[PDB]
Amino acid sequence: TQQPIVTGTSVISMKYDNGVIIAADNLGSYGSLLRFNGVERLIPVGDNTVVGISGDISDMQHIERLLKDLVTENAYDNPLADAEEALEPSYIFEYLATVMYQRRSKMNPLWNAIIVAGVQSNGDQFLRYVNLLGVTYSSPTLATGFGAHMANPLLRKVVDRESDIPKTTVQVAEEAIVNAMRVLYYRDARSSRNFSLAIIDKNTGLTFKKNLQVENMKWDFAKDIKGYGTQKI
Amino acid sequence: MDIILGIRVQDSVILASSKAVTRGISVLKDSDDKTRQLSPHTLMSFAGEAGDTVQFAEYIQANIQLYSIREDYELSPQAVSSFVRQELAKSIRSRRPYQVNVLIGGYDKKKNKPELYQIDYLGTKVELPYGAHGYSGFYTFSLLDHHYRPDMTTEEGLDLLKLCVQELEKRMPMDFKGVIVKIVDKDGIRQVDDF
Amino acid sequence: GYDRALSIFSPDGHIFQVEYALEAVKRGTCAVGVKGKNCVVLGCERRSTLKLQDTRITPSKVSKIDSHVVLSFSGLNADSRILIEKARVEAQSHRLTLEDPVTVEYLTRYVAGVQQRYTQSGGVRPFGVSTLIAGFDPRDDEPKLYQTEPSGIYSSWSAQTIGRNSKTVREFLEKNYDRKEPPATVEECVKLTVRSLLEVVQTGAKNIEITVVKPDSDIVALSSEEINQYVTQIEQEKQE
Amino acid sequence: NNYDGDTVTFSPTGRLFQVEYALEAIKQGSVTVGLRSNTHAVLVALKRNADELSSYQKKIIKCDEHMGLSLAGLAPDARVLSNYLRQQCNYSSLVFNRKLAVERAGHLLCDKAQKNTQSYGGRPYGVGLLIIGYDKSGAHLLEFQPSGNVTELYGTAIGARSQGAKTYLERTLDTFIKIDGNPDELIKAGVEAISQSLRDESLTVDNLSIAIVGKDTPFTIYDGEAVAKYI
Amino acid sequence: GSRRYDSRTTIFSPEGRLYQVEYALESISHAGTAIGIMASDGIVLAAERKVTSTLLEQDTSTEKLYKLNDKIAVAVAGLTADAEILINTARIHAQNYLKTYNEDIPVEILVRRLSDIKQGYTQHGGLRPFGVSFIYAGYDDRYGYQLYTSNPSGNYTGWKAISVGANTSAAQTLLQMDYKDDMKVDDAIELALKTLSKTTDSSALTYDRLEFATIRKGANDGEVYQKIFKPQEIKDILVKTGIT
């Protein structure tokens, strides 16, 4: 039995024609206090997988150490550790999913929602979700927390089903993600302006972008809004 | 499980136990014998939580019978009662205690005396001339305080017992379907078939 | 815990510790079991080098396992108590769960199983004891007599003997005991049991113990005078 | 002599006699051959019988859809080690959704056998194993010895008179390695290899045992009338 | 491994004997003689101390005779340290019984349990047996006055009169000669001392080389009393019988 203390908010992601995109803001909330502002919640594993984590940050750091140790362990007695026997997104996800479900079954969960984004060795896009209950699912768009309620609707307008994935480019997909992050900044009280974004492409590989900001924001209309009903001045 | 009574007279101990076994709004049985013979001259009646009562009674029975075989000797009622008390005393501080109250009626062959012991589920032991468990005592004790004499015969003890059952049948809310009466004396244990 | 495998195979395929346990049985005082038409009798030797004994309190050779089953033995006396205790506990456990007393075969099978377990368990030696188990099954009038030994094998016997000079008394029983017509009465069965012990014992004074078991938990041990009457009767008929 | 009472004792020359005696049990065992190409890996085993009335002792055991082995020596020890491999292959699939690499399989067997040679009370395994498999890096063949030593090979053989088959494969190396995309021809080379270890007896229908794994071929065992093709 | 150094204490000889038990009995045969005699109205326990030194504190010493409870006592023959381990266990067992049944433990039950412990060390555990033989003297309301003996094998037997330790062969012959069933305590006291006086390896039997105890019903009306004799009391009883 736990309760989350220092928390991270939405992680959002989607598939596009050649790969996957994932994003998450750089905030570590302490209840209503916006305590920590330099928290990286996207953690790359190798050059082909990015794990995005929300929820309890202490448990996130524990999961970082597990992934870091998994890469070390996989390299032991493995001449093909950087080739055919390298870690796949599917291997990394299943490991975490096993751990998440085992911990909930011992009534001592890792208080997180996790999205594993990556590209498999055969070029197939990998995008799957797992959380504190051990619940897992896959979809062309995946999101956690407020992202599930606000980002998914926007991302699903681009990729509404499987057949829309080949029709979606990296430029269009990234634009939708960045737009979704702006919407979350408007409407999520536990979000920040600063965020990180990661693109895993089957051709150009892993591109990790840090220190991105939400921009082109609409606030001007606020000046005209006066009172809460009858007030004119 | 509700009514168990005990009366120690001059030359015997008489135990009376109700025949009803009730579960919910149904009397499942009206001929239940709520007692086990621990040894030829020692009888134990019991009442309490369903399942626990019989499980406990039979466990005690097996242990006393084991002792009898090992030593080729019958334990005294006092010795049996102390053993039973200790088991209940252990039980009350266990993970799941035996919720079972007992009366032990026995005839000590060495002393040539009847003996009645009342033990509750906490391991509270007392030797008495007459005893009861549950709500039964609230009616019978005052009745026995009045009518009981220490030098009574077995027949007089049975008439006294009839008077208790009549009072219970009159004022008790629940129908306990009469009682099975058993006598413990020098000649052993026998049942009164017509009561 | 002490783990050592004490009972092990030898090149010739023998378990010496089990066979040496049989030698301890061969050293023990003689015990005989004879079953009749409506009874079983257990005879036991008591060595007469021990005078100034207190026969009231000295452990009896025949032990009640339940009210309907008895157990005598030959071999190490201390070892026998462990089997008897385990047997008595199992007898009460059987009554508790099955709501019926043990059959003689079942009780024998349990005791034999305990003996066997001590022949392939680490850190223990075999029981230096062979038992004769006799009695009557619940609600049954057919006499039962079984034998066990250190290895753990057990079997039923019309009549059998164990202990020192048992080969002599077995020789006697093999010609004197008729399968087609066993001892019809209690007297005949006891007499044959006493006769068989008189081939080995020495004197028929306080050396022979006799225990008679009958159906429906009817067990009684004979006194000195009662046994002495059989001894007196046999010797007078012998002089012929 | 004085240093062969248990596995925890070194000889004055630095030998482990109980391990060497366990190795001797393999030499007494019936012959089995292993060989591979770039696309497929093949096991061929000569099964042994007690007499004409008895069945023939099964030599090949399946570990997963993509891996299995053949045994030579104490069969129950092969059952224990193969059972351990089944669990490790299965652990890899359930936890990591990953087919166990044949090289890791060998490393795991080595470490399991090693622990039994350094501790008091236990004993070394009395069996030799030939593990074949097809994983992400192609076809593989391993040789396991109960000393702990595991070796990756193009081809090999273990058991009684195994030197004959081993010499043949050493000559045929350049030929059978390039049998790619042709199961029957690779098996034929294996059946011809095991034939070099035969004396007096010949390969019959209920005597021969063959197994194969490859690119688009799950680990499957052939016995009985199914191996009549290769005689 | 450690197998090399294992003596194997719980095994049979080819003849069917327990090596360690037999060798423990050989040890006990060199110990100071202890005698027990049961009379109709009490029990006597007499024991010879092992080669006493003149500077040994005799009055505040306990080597042979120990009290298990108010009704039961034992005479020791063998390793004193081993005996004390078993004695404390027996004392605890007696109290467990009293706690359970609110009755003093019957003598045989205490003897059986202590003998069962000894038996265990001969059958399992891989440890040496206790090099101790006891004579148990006690009373209960079932069998009255009782004498028992146990030895390292865990076998126990009942007796009218018995000796353990050194010179038991000679001692048992003398007891068998002079003992009779209608004997009194005062007569048994005399027999015990006379037997020790003839079997002893010492030059002459004296008070400082003895321990003595009686269990009588000499207390007031239907109750048992244990009397562990003091040095001066042994001196007096030795003169009274005409040994010194």
Added chain:
Amino acid sequence: QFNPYGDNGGTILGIAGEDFAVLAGDTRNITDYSINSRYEPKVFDCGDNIVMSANGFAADGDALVKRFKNSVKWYHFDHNDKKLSINSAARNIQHLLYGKRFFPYYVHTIIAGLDEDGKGAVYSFDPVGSYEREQCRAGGAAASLIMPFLDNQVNFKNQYEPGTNGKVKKPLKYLSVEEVIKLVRDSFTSATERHIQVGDGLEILIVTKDGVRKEFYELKRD
């Protein structure tokens, strides 16, 4: 306080024919009022001509299926590649479920296949392992909507022969694979209309002696 259970919604449906059996299920996965996936399969081919679905709390469902699939694999190893019969699979699943009697898998399990006489079979389970063979069973969120429709159309309940004064019942008969699929599709479209957790897609697994065939159909996405 931490709640180890959740509701992932969705509904499943198993029907047995004469020489075939179907196990159908929608592909929508949900939590509360949100859609997690429009296509997340929960009807699986487990080998040996057995199809299985464990609907309810998806984590427990995936765990159970995963464990049963593994049970089939080990049954082959331990018993000389013997085929696991549907009745033997059913009993095996009871022990898997009852093994967690005091911390249950929060799922309604249904398996389908052919019995040892080649006839269509469906077995249904409660969360703690009580099971029963049936011709017809709906499970999950919309079970209460679908099941009485099946009683009426598959087992012909409350339908009497016209003109017989309600004396002669409508006779039972086996339905064709074509007629069964019609009832499945109509059941799921009806459930999609009247249940918010049901929709997106319908995946049907059909089991015959030839093997396991799949069929997919679109459902309303609102």
Added chain:
Amino acid sequence: TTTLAFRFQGGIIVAVDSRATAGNWVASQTVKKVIEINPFLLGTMAGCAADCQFWETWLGSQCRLHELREKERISVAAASKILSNLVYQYKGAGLSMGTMICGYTRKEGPTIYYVDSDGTRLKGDIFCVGSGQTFAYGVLDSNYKWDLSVEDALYLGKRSILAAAHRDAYSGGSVNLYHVTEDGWIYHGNHDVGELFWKVKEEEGSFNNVIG
């Protein structure tokens, strides 16, 4: 649920319903609430489906092991006690079982034992267990006699379940009949309440409360 079993001149009658409920939802109408342990032993099921089904099939395995080890069919007393001792170990854990172990042996004769999840074990001639037990008792007790024929006994057991199926909301579906004799148990069919009710109403003239 409604289950009963009673003892009479010609042996033992056993009768049960077939309804399963999860709250007010009727989960099934075709459930087997009698377990066939062996040719001479039956077990009835009330309370939790899984607990009853799992542990009574387990009981059959234990009864089978008994006759392998002892070369003799287990007694009804011994069989019932294995189950009662099992559930007693789990007491407090939340098992919910109301069972009746019915059978014939030579030494015992026809015997019925009531066993439940709070450890109670009772031998008796007549028992009714379940949510509809009172309704079954009402019909069964008022018409019961020891001198009943096998035909009349079977009908009374059937009629008693029907009575409960009618009044008790959590009982219904169909009636499963069993007869146990010296030779073993005999199955007397599945009887749908849908047809049985109207048949009994017409032929007997009972159930006048219902709109005919």
Added chain:
Amino acid sequence: SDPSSINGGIVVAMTGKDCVAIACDLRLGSQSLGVSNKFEKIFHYGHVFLGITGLATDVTTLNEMFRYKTNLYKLKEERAIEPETFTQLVSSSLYERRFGPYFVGPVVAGINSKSGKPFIAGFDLIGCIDEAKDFIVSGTASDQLFGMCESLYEPNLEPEDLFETISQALLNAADRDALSGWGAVVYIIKKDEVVKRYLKMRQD
């Protein structure tokens, strides 16, 4: 469901001139129901006296426990235990069950056989020793006993006078408590004689 007041009962101990007294009621009940009027709460191990109030099963259990321990003490020490030593033993035994305690209020009383000094002591349920020159009280009428003892008690009372003081303290305390009374026993303890007296009191 308060363990200390289910069965009811009281114990009181006082010191006098070269003497001590300990007394108790005879009631054992089950809440309102009086069950036994013969249930004595005072026990002795050699010359050391122990009274115990509270849950009757624990009263009995602890008596059996201290009989057990003082018997072994005597065998090993070859002498009877003294009141000071026994007080420490009671404390140790109670605190050993710190988080699962016996629900009792024990009272030790006795005269040291060596020094001749009168000794009394009391304990809480987990063994905290309350040593006192004057008096110790325990049970369901402890408030009443404190009031009676504080007013009636004076130092250096003779055995015959002490008897009257302790008897009147107990009786009048018991008559103001529903769960106490139903008879009473008083022990008067001198250096080498002990007198036990049963008191006449109201039986309601």
Added chain:
Amino acid sequence: DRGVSTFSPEGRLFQVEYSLEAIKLGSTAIGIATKEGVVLGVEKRATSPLLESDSIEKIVEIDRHIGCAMSGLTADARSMIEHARTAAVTHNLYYDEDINVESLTQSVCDLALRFGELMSRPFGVALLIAGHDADDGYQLFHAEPSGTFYRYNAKAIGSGSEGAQAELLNEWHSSLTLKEAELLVLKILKQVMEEKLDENNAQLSCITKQDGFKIYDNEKTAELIKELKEKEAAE
């Protein structure tokens, strides 16, 4: 001394090889498998005439479809039989079906090598496990203390095994009837047995698909013995 799980220089486990010598001292047990059934027969070998031979239980039921005969230190077989019976019943509970004869035999053989320094020594008894299942039909297995089991068309174990096995080599063919197999066990038993074969000192049994495992009565076997003698005298 020396370790329990020690290898010899030839590559064999000392204790396993020594246990095989104990089995050679055991009484003879013969098994014959046919398409109509599997027959199991044993030499009782009573050590004395006073021993009631009907109490000698060397043929044993494991399940309705599996039987078992033993030879060697027969006391060691009791825990093996107990394990087999449990394994058979347990499998039926888990899978609602009969258990394969081979799987049952494999389960028994897993105990064999579970000894060392687990039990203290190997079993000193060999088992003939006979049975029937739907997949592989009528089967006969020989389970040794080495953990190894061979399937046999016919097999003899015990003191007269090498002589009986040579006799089974010649006599066995694939078209044997059940009656022919019964007589063949009795014939070969009578040859290798010390004492003269009769209904009291020898026991027969069989397992068929229809009637399951059955131990024959002394009356039934006596007729087969009388039938056997007449047929040998007939030519």
